[PDB]
Design a protein around this ligand. Sequence first.
Ligand SMILES: [Ca+2]
Ligand SMILES: [Ca+2]
Length: 418
Amino acid sequence: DQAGKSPNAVRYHGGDEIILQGFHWNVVREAPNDWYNILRQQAATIAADGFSAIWMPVPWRDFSSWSDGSKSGGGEGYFWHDFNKNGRYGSDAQLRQAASALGGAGVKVLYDVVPNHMNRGYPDKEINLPAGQGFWRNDCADPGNYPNDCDDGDRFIGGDADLNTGHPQVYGMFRDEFTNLRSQYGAGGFRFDFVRGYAPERVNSWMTDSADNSFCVGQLWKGPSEYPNWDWRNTASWQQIIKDWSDRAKCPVFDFALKERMQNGSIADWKHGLNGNPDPRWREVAVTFVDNHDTGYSPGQNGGQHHWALQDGLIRQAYAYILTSPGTPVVYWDHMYDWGYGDFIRQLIQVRRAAGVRADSAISFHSGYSGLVATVSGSQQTLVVALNSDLGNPGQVASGSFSEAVNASNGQVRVWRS
Ligand SMILES: [Ca+2]
Ligand SMILES: [Ca+2]
């Protein structure tokens, strides 16, 4: 657990984390109020499985609800009303035991933080920010889902719940809460939600003031077509958009360029995500995932959100590639503990660890076979990865003595050098 910043000063924490997304969308529904006890009970497992960090759900209490026609939601944390740590996932006391047990087993706790907005109209809540005082986005003219004088980022839905995160007083509030999470809830890092809602520069602000040396990740989900026509990003690549954000916030960023290639291109096009980047400075800030709570399915209620879910026929291949490649991989809870991909994912974590693959290890792609075939230069071992390809032996693409590390789904997943 080497914990340092990247050459460009990005908060990647050594570049050797292996993160577990600690929850799915329907937990509040499936294990109402018992979520932190379940995690306290699994901390030992999570640690033994190889994770270095865990991404916790929003700690700020959410008692929102929404219906209209069979299909509901609420209380997951993205529409919180207070910094109180009560209900939905568990009590403040179970949170403390959860974090104390996780941290005690060597797993960092990363908190999901939601600064863009809050449940403004919730009755019984501890934070009350009046209108006309400049605390809210809507205190200014709001022409459209574009920055106004009261919010230097996009808005959430209508934008009636958007805070002016730039207001000294709204800024200091979040800053205090972050420090709080760190001194009393053992936070080891933060996962910023909806990063397009407020300046990236503010995220660096928050990290410098509260946990300068911790791990951070931002989720920027905004494609080129969502930027104005005159903006340079309207014609850039997904990777450029994502890297610019990282350059300014000084935090790694979820690799939405690889997610977009997993969803829209071929396995061969997977080399086009941030983590395939021939530049170490580019590749090393990527946070690769296969699915999260938004993009994927969740057990229970209506399959969850599944906004951009990867087909089950590519799950094994997706994990085999983020677990063996550069960037910092995230494993989805359900894949891991619900759906039975666990043993396969345990094998890969071991292989990543044994070859000493890290954020910045080099990777080269091999042109002449079908599927994706890559040579990943681990700091201890070289890996040869052949996904859905015709590659016959590792020696056809790399010099050296090789051993079968993984061999799954009728040869569709093959990884060599132990
Ligand atoms: Ca580390
Ligand atoms: Ca905003």
